[PDB]
Amino acid sequence: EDRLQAVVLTDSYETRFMPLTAVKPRCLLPLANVPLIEYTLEFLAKAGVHEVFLICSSHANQINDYIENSKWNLPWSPFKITTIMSPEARCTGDVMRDLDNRGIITGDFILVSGDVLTNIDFSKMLEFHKKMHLQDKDHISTMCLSKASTYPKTRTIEPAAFVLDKSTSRCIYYQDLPLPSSREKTSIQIDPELLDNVDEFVIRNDLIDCRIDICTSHVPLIFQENFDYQSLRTDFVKGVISSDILGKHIYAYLTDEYAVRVESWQTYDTISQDFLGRWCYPLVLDSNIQDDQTYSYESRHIYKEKDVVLAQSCKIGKCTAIGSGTKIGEGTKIENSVIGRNCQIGENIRIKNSFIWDDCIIGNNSIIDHSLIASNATLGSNVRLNDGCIIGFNVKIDDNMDLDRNTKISASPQDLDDQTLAVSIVGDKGV
Amino acid sequence: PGISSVIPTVLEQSFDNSSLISVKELLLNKDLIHPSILLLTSHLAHYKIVGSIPRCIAMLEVFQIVIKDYQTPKGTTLSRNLTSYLSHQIDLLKKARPLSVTMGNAIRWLKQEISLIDPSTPDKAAKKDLCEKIGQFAKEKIELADQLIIDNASTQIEESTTIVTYGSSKVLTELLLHNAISLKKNIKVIVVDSRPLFEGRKMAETLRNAGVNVMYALITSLDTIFNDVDYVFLGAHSILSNGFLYSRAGTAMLAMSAKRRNIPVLVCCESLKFSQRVQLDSVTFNELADPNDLVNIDYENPVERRGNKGALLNQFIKERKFEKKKLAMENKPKGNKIGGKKGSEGESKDASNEE
């Protein structure tokens, strides 16, 4: 039951975040004024990890530096960090092959794709996995699933329709749809290979992706054997179902509580909002995980760190978090928005449902609505932004600018409009 | 003939005066009853939406329907067995769920109407005029009154508001909705929920269906919710001859809390709800229900968990009892919005003698 190793699939979903991920690594970016890797690490610790393995390729030096700086580098940690360095750009099959070549895989190894933070206890899950394994010899891997918000409507990228059994908790079919976004395929598929064996058929769609996998020693060998499987969800699970190796079982764990992985931008925002509220049961910033953090709890879901300065007569709405070393002026209307560490806010600024990253200067008499500002990117005087406007690294938005709905701004100093240099594109300036 | 005896759970030591038992699933009855009354009774018994205001209206509607369907026998006159029928209906209602003050008033009105027209007139001419009259009455003393109350409230509300609300009172819902839509002010609505009936939840749902900024709280969570917040509104059932607030469950405590934390409470009432019956405590006459309401373990109404509790009769010396109607203190509410615009609750029976 004890002694379990962890392999984390990092630097995999780059260019999916279309403006960012070009200069700095994907996972190093802060969720709520603190890096995304830390949460994942915490989760792993909670689960039960004895050795840490990270897959790095895109900007690996920075990752290494971070690791060196991190708390787990010191000898007090039960798990040590040793990174896998591989050639640039490869699929999860190739990575698996590489891992196999090296050879550290023992027993029930943990494989996590992307970064996930959830509240559910893992020991029970592990126990369940063990018991099910003890049933039959040819058991493969565990999948995590959670109940969705009644009806699906905000899910377009990965709205997977899971046909499931109640007695064994096993997947029957996996399919992706663009149905709510584009009315071309509003569609359902069922295969007849497992009809006269299961009987209890339950067709469901409202289940959210987690992508946390508890895997046996068979999986890397399987990957080595069948080199056609580049992905792990679309081709692999389906293959397993359609009897690639005959007489084999897979898991689909069902939980009533919240569990969602990071995937896009709106989804990320939603996750952040959830974190801000009391959705996750023990996951709160006021506990202080990074040790340098000095967060404290206040009334009406408001987070305040130490050395946070806010001026008199500023009406605040609901759910606000402020990072350390902030100076905010007078006459501000703040509603459902997070302000980063050491940010300098001017005077008379109306904010609604927005997001502000680490060290950003917001200019006087500006309106920000449902838009994101990345690290070290500054807003000037009189800037009016609409819903879902992503701003990249070090973008200097100077005096007087207006940007419409869903305008993406580049991060590296290419194809998308508005650049890192002085003034965003209303008058042509840049490289 | 009906059904008698057989009551679930323990009878308890204290608070034993009113009916708490009965027909839930129908078995053997008199073959003359109009089914609409039965259906209504079935609804009322297992209702989660109604709260003082709509019940009476529903009853009136039912009565109207009955009148429409009513046919005079060839032998006996229009009023001979009609009274008996009415009595039977009343008995059925009581068996299902005890009669309210509004319902009593309605009954009285009906009786008066019956007395007014003596058995001499033909069938199709009398009831044509009766139904119209009743409709007119309904239009007058209810809807118009409500509208008036709403308008009074409209002028009474100032600038920058933060309100804590409770109940499934329709008038309050109307008010809040009005605030949200037609006034376009800076309104914040905080909702309090109760265990016996999910009224707060319903209110919240209604608010959502409009698009209002909503905080959601309970009876326990009140010490932290204040720490900016000013107005407190409650829904009344009936005001007695004493002047005390004879209303639903979790109101009095809230009022007390409000009193403690500086800012007073405002309650709304109609100009027909007033009673001549004298009582100063909840022990006198109370709406008591079966302990089946306090079985579900949080979250939602339909869940059914095999947790820790699920027995009442087998347990030796165990009393699980809950109350629905309460008597709140007189001095704590300051504002009363009735048919005569504005007034104090200490007036008691100023409208009762006025009729």
Binding site: - | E140, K141, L144, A145, G339
Partner: protein
């Protein structure tokens, strides 16, 4: 669009009867719009309103009685009363109001249709109807029953009149499933055609005969259709076939 007076004179006199459609009440009385004498608002007092519950009966929309007390024929101030009503006179007043309303309704659709002023229309109507006959609605009713009142003055518009008539009141659909098994049939059909039209008959299929019956005031179309059916029945009984009527 709704404007201008109903009768010849702008302001009423002493003793003459009116009515208000009350929008808001209870302050001094009611300063609300009239529908008997001009759409310009006049005032009733809360003194001669209660005769024998008082704030519940009137309120909004409901028809309420008025009689002209005092007139200021200079700038525009009209005094109205409810209690003064000459007993049953209330009912008469109400009737008059209703008539006025109906007249107004009549001269609204035509105003919108021909795109011509309402006041002019009113002027052209209220002389052999509102003066000689009594009220105008009753005159209109009389005309609809048997035309006699419209003949007095020559009409500038006929289409408008037609529209009005239509509103007051039309093709009614009729399908006769003709399934004849007769010896001579075409001749019979011709005969039927020659009696039924003397309305609009169209043929799509061979067994199905489609006919639309023209109605004067909607209810009259039942009598004609039945007659046609009877005629059809008569037609084929002599030869040796059948006609099925749905």
């Amino acid at each position: 669009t709704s404007h201008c007076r109903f009768y010849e004179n702008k302001y009423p006199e002493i003793d003459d009867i009116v009515m208000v459609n009350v929008q808001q009440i209870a302050e001094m009385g009611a300063y609300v719009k009239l529908l008997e004498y001009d759409n310009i608002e006049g005032m009733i007092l809360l003194s001669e309103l209660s005769r024998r519950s008082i704030q519940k009966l009137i309120r909004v929309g409901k028809n309420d009685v008025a009689v002209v007390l005092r007139v200021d024929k200079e700038k525009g101030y009209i005094d109205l009363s409810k209690r003064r009503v000459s007993s049953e006179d209330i009912i008469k007043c109400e009737e008059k109001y209703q008539k006025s309303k109906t007249v107004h309704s009549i001269l609204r659709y035509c105003a919108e249709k021909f795109q011509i002023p309402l006041e002019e229309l009113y002027k052209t109507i209220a002389w052999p109807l509102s003066r000689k006959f009594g009220h105008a609605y009753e005159a209109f009713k009389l005309s609809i029953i048997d035309e006699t009142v419209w003949e007095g003055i020559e009409p500038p518009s006929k289409d408008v009149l037609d529209e009005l008539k239509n509103y007051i009141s039309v093709k009614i659909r009729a399908d006769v499933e003709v399934s004849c098994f007769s010896y001579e049939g075409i001749d019979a059909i011709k005969d039927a055609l020659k009696s039924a039209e003397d309305v609009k008959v169209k043929l799509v299929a061979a067994p199905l005969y489609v006919l639309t019956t023209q109605a004067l005031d909607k209810q009259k179309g039942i009598e004609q259709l039945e007659s046609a059916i009877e005629k059809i029945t008569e037609v084929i009984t002599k030869y040796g076939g059948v006609c099925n009527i749905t």
